[PDB]
Structure formats: structure tokens, C-alpha cells
Amino acid sequence: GSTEQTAQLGTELFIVRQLLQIVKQKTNQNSVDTTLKFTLSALWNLTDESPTTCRHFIENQGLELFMRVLESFPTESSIQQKVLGLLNNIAEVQELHSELMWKDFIDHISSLLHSVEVEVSYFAAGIIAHLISRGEQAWTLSRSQRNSLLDDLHSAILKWPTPECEMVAYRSFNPFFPLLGCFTTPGVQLWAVWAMQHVCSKNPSRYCSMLIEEGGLQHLYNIKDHEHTDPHVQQIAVAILDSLEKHIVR
Amino acid sequence: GSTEQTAQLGTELFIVRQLLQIVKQKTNQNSVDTTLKFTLSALWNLTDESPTTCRHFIENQGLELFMRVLESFPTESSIQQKVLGLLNNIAEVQELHSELMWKDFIDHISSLLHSVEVEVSYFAAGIIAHLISRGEQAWTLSRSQRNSLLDDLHSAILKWPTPECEMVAYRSFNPFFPLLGCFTTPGVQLWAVWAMQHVCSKNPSRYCSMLIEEGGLQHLYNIKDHEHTDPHVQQIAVAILDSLEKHIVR
Fold first, then answer.
1. Domains of chain B, start order
2. How far apart are CA A122 and CA A85, in angstroms?
3. Shortest Cα distance from A228 to chain B (angstroms)?
4. Where does the chain cross the membrane (chains A, B)?
């Protein structure tokens, strides 16, 4: 058992503030250590499927602080991963979209998309995928930056090796489904199917039934059957389907 | 998204120790402040269906610390609720049963069972129901106390008002099911069905669907159609069974 949900919602702002305070102190002292890594993991985990926590983070200078974390520790891939994991959760919340639309932030993400560490690149790509998915109209920065981010997104995913661990856990695939069906911007679909394939192949007994239960079969058959589909998107979609088909008919 | 499960398991020990150190420092200061309250909530929530976290708590003197918390703040219902919520989670872990078997822990729980606050007594009852359910052989303290606890458990539950809030959240009814079908010990059964009735009552959208899908029907019918069953256990079991039919077809 745990506290009831209303009580949990009561405490989010205090916990967000206390954790950000710790992050801020460590960053000022340039202290890269265990308490910082575990505090950043905790903060990331608190924002998992929590639009309320993402809003408290934004309202309490989280974005500025995390840019400072990225600037202060540009060689700490473990730190970058957790910062970007959290930002990928904020990127999923459409009412927070406009908070992420500033040049410094996008410039930082675009550069970490090119990190040679897939556990860093993956989350920069997820942020970019979600932001591009909201459409040209929602993108209030340079139009040529949107376009080149889209090609870099597609290009970066195709270079990724198979990570040795899961890099992330999901409690639902709901945030991925609108990214499918982004046929106009195939790098967006590519990230979604790559991410789905990655966790379903590494952990079928946690994810295959999840995905089937949330409607994944038809969303992916809708890609398998679609006429003018990017061949890489399609190849990974069928690989997820294969895994899903075998989870049924066990 | 959140950190992957193996990484999360690798942080549990650090988080348990940090949060226990915060409880210890606030208890030493005799300070019942906001930080103490949401530190205790977070620890409780961290033990939710987590036998590994429960073991870290035990192996790091959490029991003795929480005893002192209970003895140092005997008027703070909200403190006692959170301590007992966590201890109720420990009581669910069969491999930790013998760690809870010392007289003065059970003596204190048996006292809180008679608290006038249902939000305290509920969780004391839950610890007792789980410990008693493991049969007489596992009960290495006084045997007559166990038998009188079994009587006190049953009588206390009958005196409970309807609480004004949900006092707890459950991710799964699975730890309750063994409590059902402890026909040798009613009251152990009464706590479980009263608990199910309470959460399905106040939050049907969340708990009724979950209860049916985990097998609550066959577990409740096995109590109903069983013939020499305690009247209150039967009345509640039947109350829940009939309320659920209003849901499987709404």
C-alpha cells in the first residue's frame, strides 16, 4: 500500500523543490557525486506520467537549473542521461510545449542528439520527436532548424547500436501513439517504433501485454499496411508486431 | 518514462538510509515538521509492493527507529498513520515475518489497534491480520496473545466508522487474497473484506475493475458459498459481490 493519490499530489511541489535545491547546491559546488546522480534519478522518476510534477518543475526554475547542469558537467554522460530523461517527460506534456521553445534549450538538445552515447542521444531524440510531432504551426523557432532537426533525428537513430541494457522504463505506451502516424515526418515515427522495439525485445514479459492492451497491435498494423511508409519505420514496426503476435498465441 | 528497473533497484539502499537518517534527525530534534511528514510518506510509498526495500528498511534498524517514532510522538495521528502504513507493507512480506516477532513491537501495535482514529487502527489491524495469517507455527511470541489478538482484531473492525477519506491506495489486491480463506481465523478475513469494501466504495472507478480482473470474484464467492463462515465476513463479502455486478455490466 501507499498514501492515497490526493495526499501524493499534495506533496509533489515540496519534493520537487527540495530535490531541485539539492541539484542547485551540487551544481554550484561542481560536485559530481552519488547524491547528485540519485537525486536526479529521483526527480526524473517523479515526473513519470505526471503533468502536475512537470508543471511544478517548470514553475520552480527547473529548466534553467537543468541547462546549468548540462553546461557544468558536459562530459558526465550519466548526469546528462538523467537530465534528459526528465526533459523527455516534460516534452510529452503538450500544455508545456511553449516552455521548451527557446533557442538555448533547443541548441543544447540538438547537440546532445549527436552524442556517441546512445543513453544520451536516445533521450535528446525523444525530446525532439515530441516537439516536432506537434506540427509546423507549434514550432515558434527557426523553420530551417525544425527541418534539419528532423533529418538529424532520422539520421541519428539509424546509427544507434543495440544498447546493452534497457535505458528507461515505461508504465504506458500512450505517449508514443500520436508519434506513429506522423507519416509527414518519418524520423518522429522512427524514434517511437525504435523505442517500442527496444523495450519489447529486452523485456517482453513487462511490455508486450502492456502494448497489446493499450491498442498497439492495430496502431502498428496501420503502419504495416500503410502505402508510402519509410522502409526503416516499417521494418521495425513489423519486428514489434512479430514480438506481439508471439506474446499472444503463446 | 523513468529509470530502468535494475538501476532503480541499485538506488533503494541509498534512498532508505537517507530517508531513515532524516527521520532519526527530526525525531532527535523533537521536530514534527513538514519535512518529517513527507519523508515518512515517501518511505511508506517506497515500500509499496517492494520486498527489497522492506528488507533494506529492516537491515538498517528501521524497526527500532520507527518504534521510537511511535513512542516519541504518541499524539500525532498523522505520524502514526505513516509509520504503520510502512509497517503494514513489511507485514506483507513473508520472508520478513520473523523480523516483526518481538514482544514490544507487537505490544505497541496491539495498543494502536485500539486507537480511536480509524486512520491509525486500520493499519495496526492490517499488520496483525497479516502476521496472524501465517498460522500458529510461525507465531513465536505468546500463543495466548495471538488468540486474544485474533479476537481483538475482529471486535475492533466492527467498531470502525466510515472514514472521511480513502486512507491508502493499493496497486493490487494480491496481498489480500491469502487473507481471504483464513477461515480458521475470522477477523483476519474481516479486515481483508472490510478493506476491499472500503476502497471499492470510495473509489469504484479505480478498484472495482481491478478487483474483478485479479480474480476477486472467485475469491469472494469462495467465502460466500462456503457455509460455516462468520456472519459479518459473509455480509461484507456479499455486499462487495453484489456491488461488483453493477460494474461488470453497468
1. 5-250 (1.25.10.10)
2. 9
3. 31
4. none
